[PDB]
Amino acid sequence: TPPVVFHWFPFIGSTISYGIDPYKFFFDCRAKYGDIFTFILLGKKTTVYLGTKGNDFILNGKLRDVCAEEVYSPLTTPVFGRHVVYDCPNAKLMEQKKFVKYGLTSDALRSYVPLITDEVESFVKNSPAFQGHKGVFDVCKTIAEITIYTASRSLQGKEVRSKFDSTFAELYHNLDMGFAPINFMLPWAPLPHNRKRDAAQRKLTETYMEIIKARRQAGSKKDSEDMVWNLMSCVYKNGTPVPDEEIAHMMIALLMAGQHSSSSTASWIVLRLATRPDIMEELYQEQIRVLGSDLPPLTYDNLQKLDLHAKVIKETLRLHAPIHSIIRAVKNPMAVDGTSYVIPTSHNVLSSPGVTARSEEHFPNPLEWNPHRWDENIAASAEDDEKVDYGYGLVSKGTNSPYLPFGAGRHRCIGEQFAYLQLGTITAVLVRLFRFRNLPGVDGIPDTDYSSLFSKPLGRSFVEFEKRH
Numbered sequence: 396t397p398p399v400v401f402h403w404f405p406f407i408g409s410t411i412s413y414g415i416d417p418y419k420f421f422f423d424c425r426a427k428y429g430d431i432f433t434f435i436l437l438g439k440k441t442t443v444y445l446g447t448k449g450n451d452f453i454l455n456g457k458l459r460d461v462c463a464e465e466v467y468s469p470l471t472t473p474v475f476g477r478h479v480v481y482d483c484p485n486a487k488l489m490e491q492k493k494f495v496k497y498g499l500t501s502d503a504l505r506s507y508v509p510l511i512t513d514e515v516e517s518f519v520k521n522s523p524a525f526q527g528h529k530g531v532f533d534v535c536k537t538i539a540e541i542t543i544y545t546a547s548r549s550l551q552g553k554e555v556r557s558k559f560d561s562t563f564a565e566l567y568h569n570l571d572m573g574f575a576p577i578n579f580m581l582p583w584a585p586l587p588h589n590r591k592r593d594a595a596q597r598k599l600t601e602t603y604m605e606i607i608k609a610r611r612q613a614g615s616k617k618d619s620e621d622m623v624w625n626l627m628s629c630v631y632k633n634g635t636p637v638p639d640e641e642i643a644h645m646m647i648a649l650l651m652a653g654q655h656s657s658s659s660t661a662s663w664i665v666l667r668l669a670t671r672p673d674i675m676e677e678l679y680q681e682q683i684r685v686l687g688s689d690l691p692p693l694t695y696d697n698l699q700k701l702d703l704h705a706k707v708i709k710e711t712l713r714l715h716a717p718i719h720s721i722i723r724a725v726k727n728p729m730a731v732d733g734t735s736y737v738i739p740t741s742h743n744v745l746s747s748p749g750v751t752a753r754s755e756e757h758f759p760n761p762l763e764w765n766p767h768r769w770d771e772n773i774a775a776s777a778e779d780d781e782k783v784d785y786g787y788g789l790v791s792k793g794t795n796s797p798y799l800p801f802g803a804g805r806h807r808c809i810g811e812q813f814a815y816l817q818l819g820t821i822t823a824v825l826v827r828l829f830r831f832r833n834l835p836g837v838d839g840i841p842d843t844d845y846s847s848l849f850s851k852p853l854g855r856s857f858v859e860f861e862k863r864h
């Protein structure tokens with residue numbers, strides 16, 4: 396059995412330490428107990444295996460030994476809906492992932508760029524957020540809006556985008572309640588917020604299902620969004636088309652996925668850029684040099700030439716990746732190849748790919764946000780390891796890499812290229828339109844709110860904006 400981490404009280408264990416700051420908690424535990432330990436997380440023994448080998452052990456674990464959906468389903472199933480994601484066996488997840496991956500081809504991503512640019516530009520023109528030549532804005536609130544508009548406009552389609560002008564705003568706010576910290580223990584309890592979650596889940600499904608049906612009734616296709624796509628990409632291995640309900644639920648899940656992860660990340664980008672005016676000027680000059688002084692429209696093709704924009708994202712993900720903790724249930728006992736250790740089935744296991752990304756071993760002056768450290772290498776997709784196809788195409792199991800913001804193994808992100816496209820596009824447009832600065836006498840960046848397993852800026856962070864024109 397791995398070394399149990401010292402705590403003071405029963406069933407609180409190291410929850411508070413972990414919840415306040417996972418990374419500081421993991422590094423301290425590391426210095427005192429090595430690369431493997433067990434801490435009591437809300438009553439559950441939770442074995443943490445750190446370092447690249449830890450990530451490999453947990454993320455490349457066999458389906459026999461490690462279960463994800465068992466740990467997640469109580470929380471996510473009420474939110475996303477039935478028969479998708481984690482409310483099915485792995486094999487079905489793998490196909491659903493394949494379906495979405497289908498929907499995210501170059502032709503799809505191509506079409507999304509001018510739609511995303513238009514949303515950002517129209518937001519900046521129309522929102523109260525940025526009225527005036529010079530001002531302050533709430534970064535997280537503003538960025539969350541921009542991400543929801545950009546993702547729903549491109550990925551979700553016209554009808555959903557348009558409904559965010561009326562009811563979807565309130566629906567998604569209420570559905571998001573499902574991710575309340577309390578639902579890590581009572582996701583099944585009919586507390587008032589969960590009641591609102593469910594009402595919201597139901598009406599959201601309803602509307603999607605109406606949008607789908609109304610498409611069929613016109614017998615037509617008009618764009619590259621994931622709808623027209625799942626309607627056609629309905630076919631499962633056994634010949635069954637994905638039912639309208641599963642499509643609705645998949646879309647809900649994809650909106651939730653993008654919103655949480657991307658909005659957090661884009662917020663951090665803005666906050667970093669505000670602390671680093673040198674870097675923003677570089678980005679601006681890169682756009683001048685690589686696209687021209689006339690600053691022509693952003694396209695899928697010319698974005699990929701924005702080398703520093705990409706590194707700004709990569710480096711931000713290195714320090715601020717939204718998911719800090721990947722947890723699996725141990726289903727059959729497992730042992731650590733190089734040790735006497737064995738992990739019982741009363742344990743969960745936890746990987747933290749964020750730990751290696753801010754380690755001195757792998758990254759010199761790790762806590763320094765410097766995009767230029769990537770001058771050694773850049774890729775929006777990088778893989779030098781062996782490859783495994785789990786059902787949604789070939790992907791690296793890559794964990795010799797200390798940098799895994801999109802995870803690894805069968806459960807790894809299939810949103811990664813869309814995320815880059817969206818973050819890259821938002822950033823490029825913002826870089827054209829603005830300069831950002833911290834508020835008077837504020838140095839550096841805000842604290843991180845570690846909650847709901849989603850990192851984000853803590854508190855209400857304003858930065859100053861000035862329009863270039």
Ligand code: HEM
Pocket residue numbers: 463488492649652653656657660716717718721722800801802803805806807808809810811813814
């Ligand atoms: C910066 C942006 C993003 C980050 C950092 C991110 C991170 C991750 C990580 C770490 C995982 C693995 C989770 C695990 O092992 O349990 C993952 C899985 C996934 N992500 Fe993302 N993601 C991002 C954006 C997106 C977007 C935009 C979408 C969809 C549009 C998406 C859809 C998914 C899906 C479907 C999975 C698979 C879950 C599974 O197989 O169990 N992600 N993501």
Ligand SMILES: O=C(N[C@@H](Cn1ccnc1)c1ccc(Cl)cc1Cl)c1ccc(-c2nnc(-c3ccc(OCC(F)(F)F)cc3F)o2)cc1
Pocket residue numbers: 410413414437466467468470471480576579648649651652653655656808810845846847848
């Ligand atoms: O939002 C989630 N998954 C996203 C991931 N994603 C987004 C972008 N790319 C990937 C997602 C994936 C796929 C798709 Cl299709 C859509 C989405 Cl949105 C998500 C998944 C599982 C869990 C969950 N399971 N147990 C907990 C849990 C959490 C905390 C805790 O104690 C902590 C403390 F102490 F702090 F309180 C106890 C827990 F049991 O959490 C919570 C959230």
